[PDB]
Symmetry: D3
Subunit: 149 residues, 6 copies
């Protein structure tokens, strides 16, 4: 979990680990919504939905890990990793699996904050949707239901 999150958060190039932080475990409601507030104050929105019906799912537990890296001995990178702690009941198990990666890159020539959301390419019962990496719209997360009999 914490290191798999760290491996997805580590960027390309020389680097150093400065801080490991995490939020509280959040439980999705009937709207399937997960609102994570970054340190900069921006809200990144995710939605846990059924991979077939698209119905929003309650009972899914998430946790957001925050990593601070020194990059190239010149910058401080802030990389977030969203982890699904528990899949919703009746759905295929997703225990401590990273889903999304958020990179906060501040423009050096006096620019505003820029956020970029990537997906973790790991075969699991849950996966982030495919969309241009920006915080404009809500990013869906699909969960495979466990078929009985």
């Amino acid at each position: 979990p914490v290191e798999a999150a760290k491996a997805e958060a580590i960027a390309a190039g020389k680097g150093k680990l400065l801080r490991e932080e995490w939020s509280e475990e959040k439980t999705t409601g009937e709207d399937g919504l997960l609102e994570i507030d970054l340190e900069t104050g921006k809200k990144a929105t995710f939605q846990k939905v059924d991979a077939e019906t698209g119905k929003p799912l309650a009972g899914a537990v998430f946790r957001l890990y925050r990593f601070l890296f020194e990059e190239n001995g010149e910058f401080v990178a802030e990389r977030y990793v969203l982890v699904e702690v528990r899949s919703p009941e009746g759905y295929e198990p997703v225990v401590n699996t990273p889903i999304a990666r958020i990179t906060v890159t501040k423009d050096p020539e006096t620019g505003k904050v820029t956020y970029e959301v990537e997906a973790v390419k790991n075969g699991a019962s849950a996966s982030l949707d495919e969309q241009p990496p920006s915080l404009d719209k809500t990013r869906k997360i699909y969960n495979k239901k466990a078929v009985k009999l």
Copy 2:
């Protein structure tokens, strides 16, 4: 190992990682006993026994990891994790698997030290016994022997 120990040690709520420490690898003797001395000076006792005969087992290697967390931006939590490095010879392999979790919670209203021992719910050849979480008695650890032919 170190992060699986960290994942079991991370509590519920906002948190930050402050320190990662570990003891020396200890090898159980014929009494099967493992005495771990916490930073507070208290001795937590564990016993490696056969899951069927109950005989105490020698040759099992353990290591105790100590994690310091900042919880809710107000407290410093000290969470220990016992890890079995190597199962005893002739027994099913248990390599770098967390077994127990110890939480040191000091009462804020001028209270003494309180210790709470939980078990790691991970299907493995070794597992901690079931008992009220207190350092009153010795907590057994059961190991499954590898049957030949």
Copy 3:
């Protein structure tokens, strides 16, 4: 990856984690060569070769992780871990698997730097060769090709 590297780097005895560092991802060329420059300035040479033909392999991605440990509350240990990020195309997958461990032990009685290269005993499609642990010669790394049909 990062913690599996940390588990191989942790030595025997009381210890504490001080720093986690990593280099840039390096891609082996047609010579199969991987030159890693330690903090002391010494060059450790590795070569990615086919486990059968011995041909040097290009396209393999490596990353070197550096860990600083306080050992026994008296010394500062510097332990490197070489990790293969991606196996060369057409070869069996080796994703984020530690391969080698390098220990920098400086002689306390005013001695020069001494380097010791061990191998990670984990069954994988890639493995370090067998040789006395010293930085005298190039240490080969064997990769199993994926046979088609």
Copy 4:
């Protein structure tokens, strides 16, 4: 400066230094006002005034230092120290002198944030006013003007 601020910020009891942070140097305007935003979002207001006429003073440079302490091995204390970097022109010199100390004590039994503002008892040309230690009103800071001839 930084350590004199640290000495005023260190509380009574066992303690450890976790983080040293500081804000930007702020320059008082014609209103003499200095608005410092703590990490919790609260605004502590100070006013640089003449010790005799009471006129608000511009040109005074301040810097706010933030210290994180582990107290008694159980809590994380956040102690702020206001430092006057440069006195206003024509006034007696106050170079890198601590003035006020702010302690953020969060009630452990699920209570809101409580802030307490103390003064540094060091004989200098500038000094904080005397008032109950709370963030209800603006705390004045008096500066002694340099009389000519």
Copy 5:
């Protein structure tokens, strides 16, 4: 205070700061005694006495600062610094002045703990006595009384 203690604690050679810790403020009783317990468990004894009469002095406030240094990129040095926070009433003021320095040097060839007590050569109203630097006997600290009229 904290940095003047750090300057006396910094040894000769390349070094790095790892941890800053301090004990509680202790107040000398009628016996003038100050018992400081190092992390290793040893007790270093000091006695605050009048520089002329030799009478033990009560009301003196002390604080022990503990510094952890990485020395020469090979060792972890533990350097203590005793600081007199307040001189006893009726005696010349000694505010936040370092007095003694304690170095814990563990023998590398499997030797026991060795402690060495030096004095801070700073002209002040209080000063440590002169004695071979070992924890065998109680080290006196002399205080100059303020003569009236």
Copy 6:
């Protein structure tokens, strides 16, 4: 010393302290020369000379402190501070006084290393010369001799 060096090294803007390092105490020879090797490998040259005769001075003790700062929550600043530990014998005392400040600013748009040497504006018996802030030439340091009778 260490904090006075830190105060001169702290730049303008939001900041955080990451590391405090120092070199070995160096003693100037008959050439008065002091060669400090930064972490980047560049050599900054200083020369201790008499403020009147200009004769190079031996016996002066220096120490170079290195500070790593996080600036504006985006960059990692490396600020060096040269401190004169002891003035040469027969010269006015200069004990633990900062002299020069070196800032290593790497150009963000893929530029080489740039070094800038400032002087500490503190009235003392020793002072750095006046020259454009670059590592092109040797920067002299003037020392006032103590006149007898």
